[PDB]
Design an enzyme around this catalytic site. Sequence first.
Site, PDB file in Angstrom:
ATOM      1  N   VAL A 173       8.162  11.539   4.246  1.00  0.00           N
ATOM      2  CA  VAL A 173       9.199  11.696   3.335  1.00  0.00           C
ATOM      3  C   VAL A 173       8.613   9.637   2.840  1.00  0.00           C
ATOM      4  O   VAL A 173       8.834   9.071   3.817  1.00  0.00           O
ATOM      5  CB  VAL A 173      10.532  10.442   3.434  1.00  0.00           C
ATOM      6  CG1 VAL A 173      10.899  10.800   2.344  1.00  0.00           C
ATOM      7  CG2 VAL A 173      11.434  12.378   4.013  1.00  0.00           C
ATOM      8  N   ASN A 174       8.892   9.434   1.248  1.00  0.00           N
ATOM      9  CA  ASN A 174       7.925   8.124   1.323  1.00  0.00           C
ATOM     10  C   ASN A 174       8.144   8.040  -0.158  1.00  0.00           C
ATOM     11  O   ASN A 174       8.572   8.700  -1.475  1.00  0.00           O
ATOM     12  CB  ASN A 174       5.847   8.369   1.090  1.00  0.00           C
ATOM     13  CG  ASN A 174       6.083   6.644   0.931  1.00  0.00           C
ATOM     14  OD1 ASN A 174       5.707   6.211  -0.474  1.00  0.00           O
ATOM     15  ND2 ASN A 174       6.332   5.694   1.704  1.00  0.00           N
ATOM     16  N   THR A 175       8.473   6.532  -0.629  1.00  0.00           N
ATOM     17  CA  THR A 175       8.945   6.316  -1.802  1.00  0.00           C
ATOM     18  C   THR A 175       8.418   5.083  -2.817  1.00  0.00           C
ATOM     19  O   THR A 175       7.470   4.971  -1.529  1.00  0.00           O
ATOM     20  CB  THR A 175      11.152   5.560  -2.026  1.00  0.00           C
ATOM     21  OG1 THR A 175      11.331   6.157  -1.370  1.00  0.00           O
ATOM     22  CG2 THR A 175      11.214   5.235  -3.692  1.00  0.00           C
ATOM     23  N   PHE A 228      10.454  -0.267   3.747  1.00  0.00           N
ATOM     24  CA  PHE A 228      11.938   0.640   2.413  1.00  0.00           C
ATOM     25  C   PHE A 228      12.729   0.969   3.254  1.00  0.00           C
ATOM     26  O   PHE A 228      12.146   2.222   4.305  1.00  0.00           O
ATOM     27  CB  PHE A 228      10.823   1.965   1.883  1.00  0.00           C
ATOM     28  CG  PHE A 228      11.910   2.214   0.715  1.00  0.00           C
ATOM     29  CD1 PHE A 228      12.667   3.025   0.667  1.00  0.00           C
ATOM     30  CD2 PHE A 228      11.680   1.347  -0.462  1.00  0.00           C
ATOM     31  CE1 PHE A 228      13.437   3.669  -0.712  1.00  0.00           C
ATOM     32  CE2 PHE A 228      11.899   1.799  -1.828  1.00  0.00           C
ATOM     33  CZ  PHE A 228      12.892   2.718  -1.686  1.00  0.00           C
ATOM     34  N   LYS A 253       3.077  12.192   6.587  1.00  0.00           N
ATOM     35  CA  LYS A 253       3.934  11.095   6.049  1.00  0.00           C
ATOM     36  C   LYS A 253       5.287  12.163   5.547  1.00  0.00           C
ATOM     37  O   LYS A 253       4.868  12.515   4.387  1.00  0.00           O
ATOM     38  CB  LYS A 253       3.663  10.177   6.203  1.00  0.00           C
ATOM     39  CG  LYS A 253       5.135   8.833   6.152  1.00  0.00           C
ATOM     40  CD  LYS A 253       5.063   7.504   5.177  1.00  0.00           C
ATOM     41  CE  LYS A 253       6.915   7.003   5.092  1.00  0.00           C
ATOM     42  NZ  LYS A 253       5.866   5.785   4.841  1.00  0.00           N
ATOM     43  N   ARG A 270       8.654  13.840  -0.837  1.00  0.00           N
ATOM     44  CA  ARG A 270       8.869  14.808   0.914  1.00  0.00           C
ATOM     45  C   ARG A 270       7.985  16.175   0.887  1.00  0.00           C
ATOM     46  O   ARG A 270       7.412  16.677  -0.187  1.00  0.00           O
ATOM     47  CB  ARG A 270      10.337  14.452   0.805  1.00  0.00           C
ATOM     48  CG  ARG A 270      11.246  15.244  -0.159  1.00  0.00           C
ATOM     49  CD  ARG A 270      12.829  15.133   0.038  1.00  0.00           C
ATOM     50  NE  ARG A 270      13.112  13.728  -0.527  1.00  0.00           N
ATOM     51  CZ  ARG A 270      13.572  12.831   0.457  1.00  0.00           C
ATOM     52  NH1 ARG A 270      12.979  12.507   1.206  1.00  0.00           N
ATOM     53  NH2 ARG A 270      14.352  12.065  -0.132  1.00  0.00           N
ATOM     54  N   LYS A 297      19.471   0.815   7.933  1.00  0.00           N
ATOM     55  CA  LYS A 297      20.628   2.582   8.489  1.00  0.00           C
ATOM     56  C   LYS A 297      20.796   2.258   9.795  1.00  0.00           C
ATOM     57  O   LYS A 297      21.321   2.561  10.449  1.00  0.00           O
ATOM     58  CB  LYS A 297      19.260   3.818   8.144  1.00  0.00           C
ATOM     59  CG  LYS A 297      20.358   3.687   6.350  1.00  0.00           C
ATOM     60  CD  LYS A 297      18.930   4.945   6.120  1.00  0.00           C
ATOM     61  CE  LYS A 297      19.189   5.854   6.898  1.00  0.00           C
ATOM     62  NZ  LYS A 297      17.992   6.971   6.986  1.00  0.00           N
ATOM     63  N   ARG A 342       0.861  -1.539  -0.204  1.00  0.00           N
ATOM     64  CA  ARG A 342       0.149   0.006   0.157  1.00  0.00           C
ATOM     65  C   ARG A 342       0.899   1.366   0.033  1.00  0.00           C
ATOM     66  O   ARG A 342       0.534   2.254  -0.789  1.00  0.00           O
ATOM     67  CB  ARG A 342      -1.139   0.010   1.423  1.00  0.00           C
ATOM     68  CG  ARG A 342      -1.449   1.439   0.930  1.00  0.00           C
ATOM     69  CD  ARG A 342      -2.623   0.929   2.489  1.00  0.00           C
ATOM     70  NE  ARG A 342      -2.286   1.518   3.801  1.00  0.00           N
ATOM     71  CZ  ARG A 342      -2.007   1.862   4.142  1.00  0.00           C
ATOM     72  NH1 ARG A 342      -1.743   3.149   4.092  1.00  0.00           N
ATOM     73  NH2 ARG A 342      -1.682   1.069   6.086  1.00  0.00           N
TER      74      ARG A 342
HETATM   75  N1  LIG Z   1      11.264   4.803   6.315  1.00  0.00           N
HETATM   76  C1  LIG Z   1      11.632   5.685   4.754  1.00  0.00           C
HETATM   77  N2  LIG Z   1      12.489   6.171   4.552  1.00  0.00           N
HETATM   78  C2  LIG Z   1      12.164   7.129   3.151  1.00  0.00           C
HETATM   79  C3  LIG Z   1      11.305   6.181   2.431  1.00  0.00           C
HETATM   80  N3  LIG Z   1      12.152   6.542   1.357  1.00  0.00           N
HETATM   81  C4  LIG Z   1      13.442   7.656   1.010  1.00  0.00           C
HETATM   82  N4  LIG Z   1      13.328   7.376   3.177  1.00  0.00           N
HETATM   83  C5  LIG Z   1      15.108   7.890   3.758  1.00  0.00           C
HETATM   84  O1  LIG Z   1      14.734   8.513   4.206  1.00  0.00           O
HETATM   85  C6  LIG Z   1      15.982   9.905   4.013  1.00  0.00           C
HETATM   86  C7  LIG Z   1      15.704  11.139   3.760  1.00  0.00           C
HETATM   87  O2  LIG Z   1      14.768  11.366   5.114  1.00  0.00           O
HETATM   88  P1  LIG Z   1      16.195  12.389   6.306  1.00  0.00           P
HETATM   89  O3  LIG Z   1      17.451  12.134   5.211  1.00  0.00           O
HETATM   90  O4  LIG Z   1      15.079  13.476   6.173  1.00  0.00           O
HETATM   91  O5  LIG Z   1      15.431  11.849   7.529  1.00  0.00           O
HETATM   92  C8  LIG Z   1      15.953   9.012   2.733  1.00  0.00           C
HETATM   93  O6  LIG Z   1      17.851   9.228   3.731  1.00  0.00           O
HETATM   94  C9  LIG Z   1      16.262   7.490   2.936  1.00  0.00           C
HETATM   95  O7  LIG Z   1      17.144   6.858   3.848  1.00  0.00           O
HETATM   96  C10 LIG Z   1      10.509   5.659   2.731  1.00  0.00           C
HETATM   97  O8  LIG Z   1       9.981   4.774   1.892  1.00  0.00           O
HETATM   98  N5  LIG Z   1      10.586   5.403   3.599  1.00  0.00           N
END
Ligand SMILES: Nc1nc2c(ncn2[C@@H]2O[C@H](COP(=O)(O)O)[C@@H](O)[C@H]2O)c(=O)[nH]1
Length: 124
Positions: A43-45, A120, A41, A85, A66, A10
């Site tokens: 950030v979301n890919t 993800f 939310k 984002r 990570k 989803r």
């Molecule tokens: N949990 C999650 N993290 C994501 C997603 N897409 C990208 N990210 C992470 O979000 C990061 C960017 O978020 P930030 O650097 O702002 O906390 C990227 O480094 C990647 O590690 C996603 O769909 N779900």
Amino acid sequence: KETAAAKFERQHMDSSTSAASSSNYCNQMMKSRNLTKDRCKPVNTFVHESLADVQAVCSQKNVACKNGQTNCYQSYSTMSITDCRETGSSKYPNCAYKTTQANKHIIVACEGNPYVPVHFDASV
Ligand SMILES: Nc1nc2c(ncn2[C@@H]2O[C@H](COP(=O)(O)O)[C@@H](O)[C@H]2O)c(=O)[nH]1
């Protein structure tokens, strides 16, 4: 309740399109997949491949996630993804996103049997 495998589909799967086709992609898809129900939310890919090819990641390269866990896997191939984002204009419940379309390797974490993606991690 929904399982973690259904939740990853989803939140992250869009095999209906090949790529984002406009700057409004993430605003329409974050609202329609219910990812702005309680809060924006940030950030979301989304990944624009078949579900089978993304479930196959859990048999490719194991890598550390990570956060240090060791059930993450990195795709051997790049995949078509859209990174969404939040923008400076975003304000609940009118969450707002910038759409960035890109071809990257994906890293997911896998769990269960059958062993499938449930989170993800990153695109690299
Ligand atoms: N949990 C999650 N993290 C994501 C997603 N897409 C990208 N990210 C992470 O979000 C990061 C960017 O978020 P930030 O650097 O702002 O906390 C990227 O480094 C990647 O590690 C996603 O769909 N779900």
